[PDB]
């Protein structure tokens, strides 16, 4: 075919690209073992889109498999794991057939597949056989195992494998100001190249070196942030001016060793550098689990059993004596670590399965595509910090024993009492999209909120759209248009009916406007809160509230293959708002208005033209017709008065009466924007124009433009007119001639051919702002004296367009793309397609299920720590990941800043003064003096000053006897809305020695 | 005594620095600003399980020559 | 799919390779005009295996068209060239559906295709319109005309086109006997490296310079028939023994200009260097033929 | 004291330093020292002519910066 459905795959497409997905769509995948681990891998791969998925697992469902296998139900017990799962995986993605392989007795059947994945159900002996057949046949091979809080993955893509793009990052690009004969390239002005030694670049527009532009790649030697070297260029000529360099990613051939070879000589990728010495230990420990099993007829060590733990330690010890190189000469077996592996061998933990489900599924996608850098080749992982303090929740053969319960292999690790506390937790989940669904899935498997004192509340104000389906696995095509939270709550209760009646799905947005719903009682009843959000503002909002209510918050995020987790613990750590993230790059206005050199610039300009033409104009007209104080109110209050008044004037003076009128209007806008406006700019600054200095004005980031001659056969000229006319029609309630069809070229052409396009005449008194650091942005009386009186226009209304990037039939992206590409033609900038314009103008965030799933897994390993109320900051881990590298890193959270006043330590984030009742001002000042040694110097409510110590006696007599609320009313003249139950006051104060001191804030409780 | 250490970013880029074991984290962040353009307040550096804080030295985090630090970011999608 | 039939495509596969053919099998090709020129082009492309082939030629078959149109018979006179030819093209290769485009009044139909070829039945005016549409839409455009013993062809693959293998030759490869610190690679005894300045190579099995073998590409500076230089390798270690180099072909991006621009500013490839002075004469000549017809 | 180029049928470009009075014989031997092909097997063409062993570069009006082509007979069909 060569076809990819953008409407479904939109967000994944910006992560992987067209070519990688085309390869994925020719790849048949086979997964061996369908417990938690395999079904997690299978879900993520079926979602991503491969040619076919085949599952093999003839084992009967037992109750304990439901620990992490979210597609098994208790009714399925007895039936084959693979058979029952097949239809549910099929539902995730209609484009991907899902088949069951009945038997794997004939190894030869493996040849139907391009990638084979062996999970925890495959013996090591069989892994080695399968790997040997795969490796020697050209089949990519991956395996993975989880055992309680421990896990590993192994990757082997064969002798010959080619990585096509190591990172998935945008290629670096930049403007050149000089190239010396020895090949030293100097950037224009303050621009950094961003390259690294060994990068490759091509060039264009380099005048004087002509064949340097032919696509030849040059190897980069970096000299500083602003220069690099490419080797001698004397042979190509001599640099004159101009030049843009573009980074090019070159192919890289790598080899992998077999599982057999790597068992005795592993290449490790570390999952946590703080723990790198454990990789060798666990490498041995996992081999001993398999030896142990061969000695015990297939069985793993028993839960929390000392006798088996000792045998495991003996097996690992015999390995290190036989191979002294594996731990190192004179390095001891870490017995406590191996003992835990044995104790937990039977554990099946949602968090760990999610982490490895995401990772391995991404590795499968790499294997199919040559996109991103493969894991090479063993990775080990543990989350032992998640274990509770054994004082509170002892672990032994009794507490840890099974109970005939879907939670038995979680109990195996944590014990019964702890599992019960998870069940009785009360949580607020903010957001029900990608992370939201993963999180709700994890909580279902945890049984979290299923207990009598527990519950879950989840909220999200958005509805389900088609592109969501690629990574929000709880939703089906039939569910499109419904509410994310409601649907998600239903789906999860089907996975685990222990939650039926325990999940409160709300559709309210979280923010300052919904505090009557999410009130004091609501927040104060919670144990903790979890974010599942896609914008910084909502995160900041929730963080502020978790600080105010003193609740833990679990935070996380993704961008393509990148992700992070952060824990915020009351009275212990910084909060989310305590740190700065790098801000959005801002484009200077002169670059947008007059001097674009990137497609990003023409897209922004186009997006504003779109707003002005089809949204703002209409809104201004409607205000003019329905607000009798509108001209008046505008003369005083607007930045661009002449702008608004011209807009209303033009909108009412050139009213179309039919569709043909809209075509003419769009054709004339083309002339103005891409021809007359450009000739005007050239009139002010001719091509040969010079600077006061004597250099050419049109250089560097300034590209001399050329005016456009309309040509219906140019795709961008055509679509500018089609989309412009159709949107204008919408504004004026005119029926399109295309409303039930494609646009006919000859018909637009007919209309345009009979038009009289007016010639251009320059304005000699017009002036143009070149830099952002200079000036300029009677008529207006005249302009008002040209407005139709609203009486002329009774019942007239313009219909403003609401920008919707995800409806390919509404002409929006069509317009912004054609409009941007026309300006790009003006300025010799390469044009962009609809997918790229939609990404930039729509501010779309690349997203994929693998990363979502992995990061959610990490969040849920941290969640264990909240349940245990840990106060040792060293136990917590903020996480950072990029699956493309692959990279994983962790750090202990930052402690909250501490302060002191008089002899008193306080927490600058979490501490406050809690005052009960609508206290009188004098009582408040007196209290602080007597109880805290603090001489209140300033007291404020929001922006208003309620008291200061410089107030003279008369003003003090006015305020001192007033309750806080009345004091606020005296100053602001507004009332307290009566639905308000608290007021925050900021104070400045002096300590006992009379020096100013930072102090906590105040909360007044009405 | 002067040594080389490495800073890897979340995008895969590797930066090389020359430092002495007695340099402050502040010092190191400033060296990163001269090379990458990022301002010290926006930099997040982790090494061996710890996030590096502005008032301390490399020695406080047992950073040795050839050590690799990681510059990481908080992501905003989900 | 993602599947190539070796029993049919064996000897061709050794020419183009699996990847190139897999891309071919996702490409829809349109050919405008089915006199001799168009049917020759169509015959070869259908044999090669593309996703589909579509032909547009509504003109009636006349006796003279049989000069070079080997799929027309006298029984066909009167009927449309496109229709009569479709079924015979279709037998060349059962993997390639062959369709007929009934009309070209709506230029938007061109969006169905990845490559559009305009032969001698298309006027210079229509060629320019069609090329403008193709170029601005990212459709690959090619045109060709024969007149008596004269002919030409024009290629425009758009603003952005990537060549993945420039020649189809086997990558050069060879055994290494020494690698000096300055990058000087000397061949193992009477073997010639065969490389050219600016080729790239990767290495394997070089002992003593371990990260030289990781798949990194090195740029080749030829010193003579028996040695080439890759730049200092001090940072990598010290050569001990062994080693094989393999040439790696890197992607190359190129830009083409539109027919309109090339009519006034052509980039020529010569067909016979003994006649190079003729290219410019004939480029004027073919344009004049069109002015004559107007 | 001039430079000329030899392009082969595979796309390879060879650079030679020659004087205008050199024989075809001379040139073919320079190609042997560079490519390994023996002169009897080399076929060189320029501007419509195949270059014959007894003549000079001057006899074929080969100038500096000129490009010759080394070509082959193919055995399949
Ligand atoms: O990252 P995704 O888009 O898959 O999911 C994010 C999810 O969060 C919701 N959301 C954004 N902002 C919100 C909010 N929910 C509740 N309150 C606020 N302020 C959004 O609708 C997405 O579904
Ligand atoms: O190059 P192709 O294989 O497609 O065609 C060659 C063709 O030539 C025939 N052939 C080879 N040698 C021959 C001969 N025909 C007659 N006499 C001799 N000596 C071969 O069978 C092929 O069909």
One DSSP character per residue, A142-183 reads EEEEEETTEEEEEEE--S-EEESBSS-PPPPEEEEEEE-TT-
Of A318, A461, A433, nearest in space to A11 by CA? A433
d(CA C84, CA C261): 36
Of A121, A222, A243, A105, nearest in space to A174 by CA? A243
Q: Do chains C and D touch (3 or more CB pairs under 8 A)?
A: yes
Q: Gaps in chain C (C–N > 2.5 Å) come after which residues? A: none
Domain range list for chain D: 1-77
Around Cβ A454, how many Cβ atoms within 10 Å?
Answer: 20
Q: Of ligand 2's atoms, which has the minimum distance to the CA of residue D77?
A: 1
- Under an 8 A CB cutoff, do B49 and A533 touch? no
Are the C-beta atoms of A341 and A384 separated by less than 8 Å?
no
Question: Which residues, at least 6 apart from C202, have a Cβ–Cβ distance to it below 8 Å?
Answer: A253, C215, C216, C217, C218, C245, C246, C248
| CA-CA-CA-CA torsion sign (A764, A769, A773, A777) | positive
Question: φ, ψ for residue A256 (rounded to 5)?
Answer: -120, 150
H or E stretch at A996: strand A996-997
Q: Which of C192, C272, C275 sits opposite D36 (nearest CB)?
A: C192
Residue in the structure block whose two tokens are 């979502």: A852
Shared domain check, A849 and A813: no
C114 DSSP assignment: S
Shared domain check, A325 and A179: no
Whether omega before A886 lies within 30 degrees of 0, making that bond cis, reads yes
Structure tokens at A283: 């490498």
Residue in D74, D75, D76, D77 to alter for ligand 2 test, most ligand atoms within 8 A of Cβ: D77
Burial string for A56-92 (b: 16+ CB within 10 Å, else e) reads bbeeebebbbbbbbbbbbeebeeebbbbbbbebbeeb
Around Cβ C93, how many Cβ atoms within 10 Å?
Answer: 19
A363-A366-A371 Cα angle (round to 5): 145
Question: Got the DSSP string for A526-546?
Answer: -SEEEE--SSHHHHHHHHHHH
Tell me the β-bridge partners of A573.
A895
Q: Are strands C28-32 and B68-71 parallel, antiparallel or unpaired?
A: unpaired
- A590 labelled catalytic: yes
Of A227, A326, A328, A221, nearest in space to A283 by CA? A326
Give residue C286 CA to ligand 1 midpoint distance, Å.
63
d(CA D71, CA D77): 18
d(CA B22, CA B1): 8
The domain of C175 spans 170-248
Atom 11 (ligand 2): residue with closest C-alpha?
D77
Around Cβ A469, how many Cβ atoms within 10 Å?
Answer: 22
Of A178, A228, A187, A219, nearest in space to A200 by CA? A219
A243 sits in the region (left: phi over 0; alpha: psi -120 to 50; else beta) called left
Q: C13: exposed, middle or buried (C-beta count within 10 Å: 0-12, 13-18, 19+)?
A: middle
Q: A304: exposed, middle or buried (C-beta count within 10 Å: 0-12, 13-18, 19+)?
A: buried
Question: Which residues, at least 6 apart from D51, have a Cβ–Cβ distance to it below 8 Å?
Answer: D24, D27, D44, D45, D60, D68
Q: Which of C196, C225, C274 sits opposite D12 (nearest CB)?
A: C196
Give alpha helix (H) positions in A612-658.
617-626, 630-637, 641-653
Write the CATH number for A434.
3.40.50.720
d(CA A256, CA A269): 14
Q: Do chains C and B touch (3 or more CB pairs under 8 A)?
A: no
B49 DSSP assignment: B
d(CA C74, CA C67): 12
H or E stretch at A993: none
Are the C-beta atoms of A230 and A255 separated by less than 8 Å?
no
Shared domain check, C10 and C102: yes
C192 contacts in chain D (CB < 8 Å): 35-36
Q: Which of D10, D12, D47 sits opposite C274 (nearest CB)?
A: D47
Question: Got the DSSP string for A807-863?
Answer: -TTSSHHHHHHHHHHHHHHHTTPPP--HHHHHHHHTTPPP--HHHHHHHHHHHHHHH
Helix A964-972 vs helix A921-932: crossing angle, to nearest 10: 120
Shared domain check, C99 and C9: yes
d(CA A30, CA A327): 34
d(CA A615, CA B24): 54
H or E stretch at B16: strand B14-20
Q: Of ligand 1's atoms, which has the minimum distance to the CA of residue A472?
A: 4
Tell me the β-bridge partners of A143.
A118, A154
Around Cβ C103, how many Cβ atoms within 10 Å?
Answer: 8
Q: A740: exposed, middle or buried (C-beta count within 10 Å: 0-12, 13-18, 19+)?
A: exposed
Structure tokens at A96: 């991907």
The three-state secondary structure class of D30 is helix
Are the C-beta atoms of C35 and C81 separated by less than 8 Å?
yes
Atom 5 (ligand 2): residue with closest C-alpha?
D77
d(CA A900, CA A656): 71
Are the C-beta atoms of A523 and A534 separated by less than 8 Å?
no
Question: From the candidates C11, C189, C273, C275, which should be mutated to test the interface with D, based on the most D CB atoms within 10 A?
Answer: C273
d(CA A262, CA A267): 7
Q: Is the CB of D76 inside a 6 Å radius of any atom of ligand 2?
A: yes
Residue in the structure block whose two tokens are 């990757």: A155
Total residue count of chain D as it appears in this document = 77
Are the C-beta atoms of A96 and A52 separated by less than 8 Å?
yes
H or E stretch at C130: helix C124-137
Are the C-beta atoms of D7 and C190 separated by less than 8 Å?
no
Q: How many CB pairs under 8 A join A and B?
A: 103
Computed on alpha carbons and rounded to an integer, the radius of gyration of chain D in Å comes to 12
CATH fold of D1-77: Ubiquitin-like (UB roll) (3.10.20)
Are the C-beta atoms of A914 and A1004 separated by less than 8 Å?
no
Are the C-beta atoms of A54 and A100 separated by less than 8 Å?
yes
Shared domain check, C40 and C111: yes
Sheet holding C218-219, edge to edge: C218-219, C200-204, C244-248, C173-179, C184-187, C227-229, C221-224
Residue in A482, A517, A534 to alter for ligand 1 test, most ligand atoms within 8 A of Cβ: A534
Atom 4 (ligand 2): residue with closest C-alpha?
D77
d(CA D57, CA C287): 38
Shared domain check, A890 and A839: no
d(CA A475, CA A494): 13
| CA-CA-CA-CA torsion sign (A962, A966, A968, A970) | negative
Q: Do chains B and A touch (3 or more CB pairs under 8 A)?
A: yes
B11 contacts in chain A (CB < 8 Å): 167, 169, 882
Question: Got the DSSP string for A229-282?
Answer: E----GGG----B--EEEEEPPPEEE----HHHHHHS--B--S-GGGTHHHHHH
Q: Of ligand 1's atoms, which has the minimum distance to the CA of residue A537?
A: 19
Q: Is the CB of D74 inside a 6 Å radius of any atom of ligand 2?
A: no
Write the CATH number for A986.
3.10.290.60
Q: Is the CB of B77 inside a 6 Å radius of any atom of ligand 1?
A: yes
- Under an 8 A CB cutoff, do A273 and B47 touch? yes
- Greatest extent of chain B over all pairs of C-alpha atoms, in Å: 46
Are the C-beta atoms of A397 and A305 separated by less than 8 Å?
yes
Give alpha helix (H) positions in chain B.
25-36
Termini Cα distance of chain A: 68
Pick the CATH number of B1-78 from 3.40.50.300, 3.40.50.11810, 3.40.50.1220, 3.10.20.90: 3.10.20.90
Q: Are strands A150-156 and A378-382 parallel, antiparallel or unpaired?
A: antiparallel
Are the C-beta atoms of B75 and A559 separated by less than 8 Å?
yes
B72 contacts in chain A (CB < 8 Å): 564, 880, 889
- Under an 8 A CB cutoff, do C219 and A202 touch? no
d(CA C284, CA A75): 82
Are the C-beta atoms of A881 and A850 separated by less than 8 Å?
no
Are the C-beta atoms of A874 and A432 separated by less than 8 Å?
no
Structure tokens at A324: 């002294």
- The answer to whether the annotation marks C11 as part of a ligand binding site is yes
**Measured torsion, CA atoms of residues C50, C54, C55, C56, in degrees rounded to the nearest 10:** -150
Question: φ, ψ for residue A776 (rounded to 5)?
Answer: 155, 130
Q: Is the CB of A465 inside a 6 Å radius of any atom of ligand 1?
A: no
Write the CATH number for C219.
2.40.30.180
The residues of C whose Cβ lies within 8 A of any Cβ of D are 166-167, 169, 192, 194, 196, 225, 272-275
Burial string for A495-531 (b: 16+ CB within 10 Å, else e) reads bbebbeebbebbeeebeeeebeebeeeebeebbbbbb
Experimental method: X-ray
Structure tokens at C118: 């305009």
Binding residue positions of A for ATP = 11, 434, 460, 468, 471-472, 484, 510, 535
Shared domain check, C110 and C4: yes
A300 DSSP assignment: P
Are the C-beta atoms of A919 and A1006 separated by less than 8 Å?
no
Shared domain check, A720 and A781: yes
Are the C-beta atoms of A138 and A256 separated by less than 8 Å?
no
**Measured torsion, CA atoms of residues A48, A53, A56, A61, in degrees rounded to the nearest 10:** 60
Atom 5 (ligand 1): residue with closest C-alpha?
A433
Q: Is the CB of D77 inside a 6 Å radius of any atom of ligand 2?
A: yes
d(CA A191, CA A175): 8
Whether omega before A141 lies within 30 degrees of 0, making that bond cis, reads no
Q: Are strands C28-32 and C115-118 parallel, antiparallel or unpaired?
A: parallel
A734 DSSP assignment: P
Give residue A858 CA to ligand 1 midpoint distance, Å.
20
Resolution of the model in angstroms? 2.4
Termini Cα distance of chain D: 44
Termini Cα distance of chain B: 46
Residue in A473, A531, A533 to alter for ligand 1 test, most ligand atoms within 8 A of Cβ: A533
Q: Is the CB of A462 inside a 6 Å radius of any atom of ligand 1?
A: yes
Distances (CA, A) of A523 to A511, C95, C185: 13, 66, 71
Write the CATH number for C89.
3.50.50.80
A166 contacts in chain B (CB < 8 Å): 12
Residue in the structure block whose two tokens are 């996608």: A365
Question: Which residues, at least 6 apart from A329, have a Cβ–Cβ distance to it below 8 Å?
Answer: none
Structure tokens at A412: 């195996």
| CA-CA-CA-CA torsion sign (A519, A522, A528, A532) | negative
Burial string for A132-167 (b: 16+ CB within 10 Å, else e) reads ebbbeeebbbbbbbbbbbbbbbbbbbbeebebbbbb
Nearest residue of A to residue C159, measured between CA atoms: A830
Question: Got the DSSP string for A49-84?
Answer: --SEEEEE--SBP-GGGGGT-TT--GGGTTSBHHHH
Shortest Cα–Cα distance, D13 to chain C (Å): 7
Give residue A460 CA to ligand 1 midpoint distance, Å.
6
């Amino acid at each position: 075919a060569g076809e990819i459905d953008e409407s479904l795959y939109s967000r994944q497409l910006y992560v992987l690209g067209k070519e990688a997905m085309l390869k994925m769509q020719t790849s048949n995948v086979l997964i061996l073992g369908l417990k938690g681990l395999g079904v997690e891998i299978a879900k993520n791969v079926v979602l991503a889109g491969v040619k076919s998925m085949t599952v093999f697992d003839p084992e009967p469902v037992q109750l304990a498999d439901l620990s992490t296998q979210f597609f098994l139900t208790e009714k399925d017990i007895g039936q084959k794991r693979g058979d029952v799962t097949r239809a549910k995986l099929a539902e995730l993605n209609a484009y991907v057939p899902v088949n069951v392989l009945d038997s794997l007795d004939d190894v030869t059947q493996l040849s139907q597949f391009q990638v084979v994945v062996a999970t925890d159900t495959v013996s090591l002996e069989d892994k080695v056989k399968i790997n040997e057949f795969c490796h020697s046949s050209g089949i990519r091979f991956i395996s993975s195992e989880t055992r309680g809080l421990f896990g590993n993955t192994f990757v082997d893509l064969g002798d010959e494998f080619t990585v096509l793009d190591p990172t998935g990052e945008e290629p670096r690009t930049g403007m050149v100001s000089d190239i010396e004969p020895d090949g030293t390239v100097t950037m224009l002005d303050d621009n950094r190249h961003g390259l690294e030694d060994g990068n490759f670049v091509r060039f264009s527009e380099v005048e004087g070196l002509d064949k340097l532009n032919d696509g030849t790649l040059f190897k980069v030697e970096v000299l500083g942030p602003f220069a690099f070297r490419i080797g001698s260029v004397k042979e190509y000529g001599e640099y004159k001016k101009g030049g843009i360099f573009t980074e090019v990613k070159v192919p890289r051939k790598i080899s992998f060793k077999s599982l057999k070879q790597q068992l005795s000589n592993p290449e490790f990728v570390f999952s946590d550098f703080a723990k790198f010495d454990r990789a060798a230990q666990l490498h041995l420990g996992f081999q001993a689990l398999h030896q142990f099993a061969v000695r015990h007829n297939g069985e793993l060590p028993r839960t929390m059993n000392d006798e088996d733990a000792n045998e495991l330690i003996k097996l690992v010890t015999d390995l290190s004596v036989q191979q002294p190189e594996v731990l190192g000469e004179g390095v001891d077996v870490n017995e406590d670590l191996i003992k835990e592996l044995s104790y937990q061998a039977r554990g099946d933990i949602p968090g760990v399965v999610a982490f490895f489900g995401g990772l391995v599924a991404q590795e499968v996608l790499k294997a199919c595509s040559g996109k991103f850098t493969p894991l090479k080749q063993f990775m080990y992982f543990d989350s032992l910090e998640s274990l509770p303090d054994p004082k509170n929740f002892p672990r032994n053969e009794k507490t840890t024993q099974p109970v005939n319960s879907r939670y038995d292999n979680q109990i195996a690790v944590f014990g019964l009492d702890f599992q019960k506390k998870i069940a009785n937790s009360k949580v607020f989940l903010v957001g029900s999209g990608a992370i939201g669904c993963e999180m709700l899935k994890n909580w279902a498997l945890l049984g979290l909120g299923s207990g009598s004192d527990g519950y879950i509340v989840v909220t999200d104000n958005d509805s389900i759209e088609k592109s969501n389906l690629n990574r929000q696995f709880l939703f089906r095509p039939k569910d499109v248009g419904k509410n994310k939270s409601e649907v998600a709550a239903e789906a999860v209760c089907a996975m685990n009916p222990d939650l039926k009646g325990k999940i409160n799905a709300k559709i309210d947005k979280v923010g300052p406007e919904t505090e009557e719903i999410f009130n004091d009682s609501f927040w104060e009843s919670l144990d903790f809160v979890t974010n599942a959000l896609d914008n910084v503002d909502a995160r900041t909002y929730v963080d502020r509230r978790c600080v105010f209510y003193r609740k833990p918050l679990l935070e996380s995020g993704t961008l393509g293959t990148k992700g992070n987790t952060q824990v915020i613990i009351p009275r212990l750590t910084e909060s989310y708002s305590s740190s700065r993230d790098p801000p959005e790059k801002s484009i200077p206005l002169c670059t947008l208005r007059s001097f674009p050199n990137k497609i990003d610039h023409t897209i922004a300009w186009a997006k504003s033209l779109f707003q002005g033409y089809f949204t703002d104009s209409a809104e201004n007209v409607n205000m003019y017709l329905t607000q009798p104080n509108f001209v008046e109110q505008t003369l005083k209050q607007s930045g661009d008065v002449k702008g608004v008044l011209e807009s209303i004037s033009d909108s009412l003076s050139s009213k179309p009466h039919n569709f043909e009128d809209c075509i003419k209007w769009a054709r004339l806008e083309f002339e103005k924007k891409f021809n007359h406006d450009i000739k005007q700019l050239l009139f002010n600054f001719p091509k040969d124009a010079k600077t006061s200095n004597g250099e050419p004005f049109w250089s560097g980031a300034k590209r001399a433009p050329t005016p456009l001659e309309f040509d219906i056969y140019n795709n961008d000229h055509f679509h500018f007119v089609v989309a412009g006319a159709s949107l204008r029609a919408y504004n004026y309630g005119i029926k399109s001639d295309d409303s039930n069809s494609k646009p006919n070229v000859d018909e637009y052409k007919s209309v345009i051919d009979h038009m009289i396009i007016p010639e251009f005449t320059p304005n000699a008194n017009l002036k143009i702002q070149v830099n952002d650091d200079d000036p300029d942005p009677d008529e207006i009386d005249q302009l008002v004296s040209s407005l139709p009186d609203p009486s002329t226009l009774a019942g007239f209304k313009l219909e403003p367009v609401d920008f919707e990037k995800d409806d390919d039939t509404n002409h929006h992206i069509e317009f912004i793309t054609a409009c941007s590409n026309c300006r790009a033609q003006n300025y010799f900038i390469e044009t962009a397609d609809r997918q790229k314009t939609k990404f930039i103008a729509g501010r779309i965030i690349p997203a994929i299920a693998t990363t979502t799933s992995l990061v959610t897994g990490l969040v849920n390993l941290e969640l264990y720590k909240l349940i245990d109320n840990k106060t040792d900051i060293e136990q917590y881990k903020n996480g950072f990941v990029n699956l493309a590298l692959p990279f994983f890193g962790f750090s202990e959270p930052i402690a909250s800043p501490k302060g002191e006043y008089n002899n008193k330590k306080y927490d600058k984030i979490w501490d406050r003064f809690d005052i009960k009742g609508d206290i009188k001002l004098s009582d408040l000042i007196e209290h602080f003096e007597k109880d805290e040694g603090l001489e209140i110097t300033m007291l404020s409510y929001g922006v208003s000053l309620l008291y200061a110590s410089f107030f003279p006696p008369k003003k003090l007599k006015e305020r001192l006897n007033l309750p806080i609320t009345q004091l606020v009313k005296l100053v602001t003249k507004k009332d307290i809305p009566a639905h308000v139950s608290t007021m925050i006051l900021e104070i400045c104060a002096d300590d006992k020695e009379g020096e100013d001191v930072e102090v906590p804030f105040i909360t007044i409780h009405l | 005594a002067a040594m080389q250490i490495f800073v890897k970013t979340l995008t895969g880029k590797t930066i090389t620095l020359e430092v002495e074991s007695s340099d402050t984290i502040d010092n190191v962040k400033s060296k990163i600003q001269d090379k990458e353009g990022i301002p010290p307040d926006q930099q997040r550096l982790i090494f061996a399980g710890k996030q590096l804080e502005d008032g301390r030295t490399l020695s406080d985090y047992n950073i040795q020559k050839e050590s690799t630090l990681h510059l990481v970011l908080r992501l905003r999608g989900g």
